[PDB]
Amino acid sequence: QDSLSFGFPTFPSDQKNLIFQGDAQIKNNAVQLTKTDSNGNPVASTVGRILFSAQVHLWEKSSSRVANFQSQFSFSLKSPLSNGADGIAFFIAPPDTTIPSGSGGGLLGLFAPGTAQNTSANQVIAVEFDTFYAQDSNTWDPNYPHIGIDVNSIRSVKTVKWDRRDGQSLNVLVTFNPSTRNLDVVATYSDGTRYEVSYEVDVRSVLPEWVRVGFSAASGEQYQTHTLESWSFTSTLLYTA
Amino acid sequence: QDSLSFGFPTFPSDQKNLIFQGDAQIKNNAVQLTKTDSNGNPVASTVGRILFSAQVHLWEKSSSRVANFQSQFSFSLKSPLSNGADGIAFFIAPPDTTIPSGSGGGLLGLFAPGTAQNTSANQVIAVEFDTFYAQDSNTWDPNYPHIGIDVNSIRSVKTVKWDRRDGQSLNVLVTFNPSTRNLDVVATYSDGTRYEVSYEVDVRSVLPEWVRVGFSAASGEQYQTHTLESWSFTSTLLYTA
Ligand SMILES: OC[C@H]1O[C@@](CO)(O[C@H]2O[C@H](CO)[C@@H](O)[C@H](O)[C@H]2O)[C@@H](O)[C@@H]1O
Ligand SMILES: OC[C@H]1O[C@@](CO)(O[C@H]2O[C@H](CO)[C@@H](O)[C@H](O)[C@H]2O)[C@@H](O)[C@@H]1O
Ligand SMILES: [Ca+2]
Ligand SMILES: [Ca+2]
Numbered sequence: 199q200d201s202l203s204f205g206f207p208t209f210p211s212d213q214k215n216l217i218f219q220g221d222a223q224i225k226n227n228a229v230q231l232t233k234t235d236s237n238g239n240p241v242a243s244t245v246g247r248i249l250f251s252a253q254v255h256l257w258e259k260s261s262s263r264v265a266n267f268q269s270q271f272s273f274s275l276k277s278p279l280s281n282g283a284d285g286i287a288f289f290i291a292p293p294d295t296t297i298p299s300g301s302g303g304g305l306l307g308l309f310a311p312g313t314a315q316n317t318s319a320n321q322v323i324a325v326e327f328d329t330f331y332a333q334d335s336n337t338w339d340p341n342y343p344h345i346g347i348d349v350n351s352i353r354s355v356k357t358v359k360w361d362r363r364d365g366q367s368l369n370v371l372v373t374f375n376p377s378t379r380n381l382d383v384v385a386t387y388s389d390g391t392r393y394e395v396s397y398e399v400d401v402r403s404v405l406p407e408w409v410r411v412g413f414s415a416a417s418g419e420q421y422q423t424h425t426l427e428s429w430s431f432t433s434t435l436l437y438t439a
Numbered sequence: 440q441d442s443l444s445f446g447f448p449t450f451p452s453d454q455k456n457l458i459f460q461g462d463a464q465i466k467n468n469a470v471q472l473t474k475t476d477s478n479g480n481p482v483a484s485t486v487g488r489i490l491f492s493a494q495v496h497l498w499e500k501s502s503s504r505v506a507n508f509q510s511q512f513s514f515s516l517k518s519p520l521s522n523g524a525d526g527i528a529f530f531i532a533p534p535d536t537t538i539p540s541g542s543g544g545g546l547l548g549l550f551a552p553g554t555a556q557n558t559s560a561n562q563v564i565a566v567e568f569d570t571f572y573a574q575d576s577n578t579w580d581p582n583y584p585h586i587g588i589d590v591n592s593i594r595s596v597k598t599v600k601w602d603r604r605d606g607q608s609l610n611v612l613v614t615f616n617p618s619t620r621n622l623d624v625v626a627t628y629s630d631g632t633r634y635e636v637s638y639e640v641d642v643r644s645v646l647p648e649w650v651r652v653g654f655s656a657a658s659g660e661q662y663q664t665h666t667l668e669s670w671s672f673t674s675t676l677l678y679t680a
C-alpha cells in the first residue's frame with residue numbers, strides 16, 4: 199500500500215499485529231519493553247523490542263517516491279534507584295531485523311558490539327532517549343542524559359540535552375519530511391517542558407524500500423522500566439521535486 | 440490497534456502485506472484474482488483470493504466496542520463469452536481463513552459445497568457481485584446478475600439487480616456503522632449508474648473479534664477475468680450506545 203496508518207491508544211493483552219522480541223510483553227495495557235519481576239520492578243540485564251507486523255513502504259525506486267511519515271508515542275521510565283538505564287528507542291529497520299548478539303545495556307538492543315559504530319555495517323534509523331552516559335562503557339555518549347538521532351551508529355549524529363523524570367510520561371512526535379529530508383523530533387512533558395532535535399537524512403541511502411517500525415529498550419547493570427503507553431503511526435508515499 | 444487504514448491506489452508487483460491464495464497474482468498494477476493465460480485471457484476452473492496481512496480488530500468484548508469500517512474499491516470484469524462467470528466478492532472472515540475444498544465456480548471460493556447454505560457452519564460476511572445465475576446450477580440465486588450481501592451462506596440474505604458491463608470499472612463503497620448496525624453498499628459505473636443495498640447485522644454474533652479482510656473470485660465452466668484495480672480500507676473501534 200502507498201499509505202498505511204495504525205493507532206494504539208493503549209495496549210490490551212490480546213495483540214495480533216505486534217512482533218515481540220526479547221523480554222517485551224504486555225502488562226497493564228502498556229508494553230513493558232524490559233523485564234520486570236512479579237512486584238513490577240525493573241531488573242538488570244534485559245532487552246526487549248516490538249515491531250508492527252505490517253511492512254511500511256518507505257520509498258519506491260521505480261516511481262521515485264519517498265514516504266512522509268509521522269510517529270507519535272508516549273512512554274514513562276521508572277526505577278527504585280535514580281540511575282535508571284539504559285534507555286528506549288523508536289527505530290526503523292529492515293523487515294527481518296532481530297536483536298543483535300550482545301546488544302544489551304548501552305547498545306539499546308539495536309547494535310552489535312563489534313559494529314556499533316561502523317556506519318557501513320548497519321541499516322537503522324532510531325530516535326533514542328538515552329539515560330546512561332558513563333564514559334567508560336558508553337564512550338560515544340555526550341556527558342549527560344539526551345535524546346539522540348542514530349543513523350547506522352550508536353554514536354548519535356545529533357543530540358540535545360534531555361531531563362529524565364521518574365514516572366512521568368514523555369509525549370513524542372517524530373516526523374520525516376521527504377521534501378526537505380528533515381527528521382524532526384519533538385518531546386514534551388505534561389507541564390510543557392519541550393525538547394527538540396532534527397537532522398537532515400536521505401532515507402533512501404540508508405534503508406531498503408520496505409521496512410518495519412518499532413521500539414527497543416535495554417537495561418545493563420543499571421535498570422529501569424521502559425513502558426510504552428501509546429503509539430500511532432502514519433506513512434504516505436509522496437512525489438518529490 | 441484500535442484503528443487501522445491502508446490504501447492501494449494501484450497494485451505494483453512488489454507487494455509485502457498481501458496474502459495470496461489460489462491463483463491470485465498481480466499483473467499490470469492490478470490484482471488478477473482468477474487465472475489468465477499468457478495472453479491475459481481468462482480460463483476456466485480457477486479460484487483466487489487476497490487478504491491484507493494485518494488482522495483487523497472488528498470488535499472488543501471487554502470494552503463493548505465495535506468497529507466502524509469503510510472499504511472502497513474498484514474492479515472490472517472481462518470475457519469474450521456471453522456469460523462470464525462466476526463473480527468477485529469483498530469478504531471478512533476469521534484470520535486463518537483459506538480456500539475451502541471444492542469452493543470453485545458458483546461458491547466464489549468462499550464456501551464448501553456441503554455447508555454452503557448452512558449458516559451455523561460458516562463465519563463470513565461478503566458482498567458479492569454475481570454474474571452467473573443459471574437456475575439449474577446456482578439454484579440459490581435470483582434469476583439475473585446481482586449484488587448480494589452474504590452472511591454465513593451463499594444464498595444472499597439480500598440482493599438487488601445489477602448490470603454487468605464488460606471491461607468497465609465499477610466503484611464500490613462498503614461501510615458498516617456500529618450504531619445502527621447497517622452494512623451499506625453503494626456501487627457506481629463511470630456514467631453515474633448507481634446501485635444500493637443495505638442490511639442490518641450485528642457482526643459480533645457472526646465474526647470473531649479479530650478478522651482479516653480481502654477479496655475472492657472464481658470461474659467454473661464459464662469464465663471471465665476478475666481484476667481488482669484499487670482498494671482503500673479504514674476501521675476504528677467505537678463505543679456502541
Ligand atoms: O553498573 C554499571 C557500571 O558498569 C558499566 C560497565 O563496567 O556499564 C554497564 O551498565 C550500564 C548501565 O546498565 C550499561 O550502559 C553498560 O553497557 C554496561 O557495561 C559502567 O560504565 C557502569 O558504571
Ligand atoms: O456451464 C455451466 C454448467 O456446468 C456446471 C457444472 O457441470 O456449473 C459449473 O459452472 C458454473 C459457471 O462457471 C458454476 O456456477 C458452477 O459452480 C460450476 O459447477 C453446471 O451446473 C452448469 O449448468
Ligand atoms: Ca547510553
Ligand atoms: Ca452465482
Ligand SMILES: [Mn+2]
Pocket residue numbers: 326328339340344346352354
Ligand atoms: Mn546516546
Ligand SMILES: [Mn+2]
Pocket residue numbers: 567569579580581587593595
Ligand atoms: Mn448470488
